[PDB]
Write a protein that binds this ligand. Sequence first.
Ligand SMILES: CCOC(=O)c1cn[nH]c1
Ligand SMILES: CCOC(=O)c1cn[nH]c1
Lengths: 216, 211
Amino acid sequence: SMKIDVVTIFPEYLQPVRQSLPGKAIDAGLVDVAVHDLRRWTHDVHKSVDDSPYGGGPGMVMKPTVWGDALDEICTSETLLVVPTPAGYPFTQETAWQWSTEDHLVIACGRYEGIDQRVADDAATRMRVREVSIGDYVLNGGEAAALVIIEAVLRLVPGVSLLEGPSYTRPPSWRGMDVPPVLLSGDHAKIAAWRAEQSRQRTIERRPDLLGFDSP
Amino acid sequence: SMKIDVVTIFPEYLQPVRQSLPGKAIDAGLVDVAVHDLRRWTHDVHKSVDDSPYGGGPGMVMKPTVWGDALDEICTSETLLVVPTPAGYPFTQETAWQWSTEDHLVIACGRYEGIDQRVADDAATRMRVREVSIGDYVLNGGEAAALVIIEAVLRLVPGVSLLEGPSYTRPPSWRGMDVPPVLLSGDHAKIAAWRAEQSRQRTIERRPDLL
Ligand SMILES: CCOC(=O)c1cn[nH]c1
Ligand SMILES: CCOC(=O)c1cn[nH]c1
């Protein structure tokens, strides 16, 4: 069974929920997901986890010491350490398929200004490290990106190109709008053709990059 | 004050949590977020929300009569309707900035196989509709994508290029590794030039597509 550990200063936010895809996986016994409060590894009364950046700039950077103790306790040399960040290598469907065979994923959630770089540098001396982006926008912390990665990966676990065109179900006419009649005909070959053409025009319009063309 | 309505068959999973950024905004009174269970608008005892695809194929497609009623109740002509889908236009930082000044966002979460296309086509005749992808991977449903979109938009509400390089804070030395000396130099022109070169090298290595 696969084990996923998540580390965050917002533990309530990432606590697993029974009625969800990861919730079902856990219940089928196919995965163990544990959430850890980063503040468990702090010593001071005020339990501080970040500080102003060396060299100046906005916001705060998470301290290396606290992350060091957390990952020392949670990770082994076998661990794949996942770190969401706007500056990461791209997380894609290939990435999801690959991670779906892993024994132990640890996901380190940190603020967007970053965890002190020495943390990832240190971890890399003992385990495989993957800093990754799920897309080109900014989140305040890695938490929401962790939830996307967990969804993408777990649905590919055993036992759990081109854009898709429009899809339709009953009734065949609704508010004066009809389902494309080819879909009603039962001709497998004609239906395959119409769907291919629909996918072509959608991909060219919305995602020309996928077909090897310049973006808008 | 911004209003966000989220429509889903997984209401617990999407319930706001106090200990989060969206939870802070809500308690600060900068947004009101409302989560609705789609099953509220079903017709039968089974609370059916999908049905087999015309033309055949795997998976199921969400019913137009059910989503139709739900959006009639929730949306107004001022609504910007958001539909996460792998087939969408890309959601980017530019998109988040645009939506951050909207009065009413409604986010329709469905399974990845899709919602009957006539729902969006119908809605687009009396309100603004945006189908968007948050990245090139497959989720079972739009729920996690909605959390990401809400996160990116809300942090841009008042009150709540190249890649960024490495960042550092105290202590100066840790486990045999020193913060790069130039950052403690007090030469802020040189610091900006060093950070630009770090950004350039990191972008070459991790995202060469951005050049
Ligand atoms: C630490 C925050 O991380 C992000 O904002 C992100 C991750 N992927 N895309 C954006
Ligand atoms: C309705 C399911 O939505 C997705 O799978 C998705 C959205 N953006 N990237 C993937």
